[PDB]
């Protein structure tokens, strides 16, 4: 396995985002995502708190095409947060939207325990 999402079937790799503002971090990302579709899928990094749905990004909406992704333009709670989860979300990219959730969303920090 790997970060997967609903499902072992669609798997991720990316670092932790507990704070706001992520940036392009030298971490880097990958996404594969086992199926019948022609493309692969479009990931939607959403950061709420069950009742607040936020989302906000700077490219952590990124859309898969041989079942695979390549990159390190993602960013998640983007033009900042505060007091919210990361709902990493993978929404699916045909007629039938298969809209999938990840397995722990871990509460962000603003400032940091010390800098």
């Known amino acids: ?8 079937n669609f798997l991720c790799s990316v670092l932790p985002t ?7 971090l030298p ?18 990094v959403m950061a709420g708190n069950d009742e607040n ?3 906000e990004l700077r490219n ?3 859309a898969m095409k041989n079942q ?6 993602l960013r998640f709670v983007g033009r900042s947060g505060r007091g919210k989860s990361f709902t990493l979300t993978i929404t699916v990219f045909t ?8 397995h722990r969303a871990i509460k962000i920090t ?3 325990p010390r800098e």
């Open 110 to 112: 603003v400032d940091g």
């Open 27 to 44: 971490i880097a990302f990958k996404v594969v995502a086992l199926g019948d579709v022609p493309d692969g899928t479009l990931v939607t």
């Open 60 to 62: 952590a909406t990124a």
């Open 18 to 24: 507990h704070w706001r503002c992520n940036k392009t």
């Open 95 to 102: 007629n039938p939207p298969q809209v999938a959730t990840y």
């Open 68 to 73: 695979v992704a390549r990159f390190n333009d």
């Open 53 to 55: 749905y936020s989302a």
């Open 1 to 8: 396995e790997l970060v997967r999402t609903d499902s072992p």
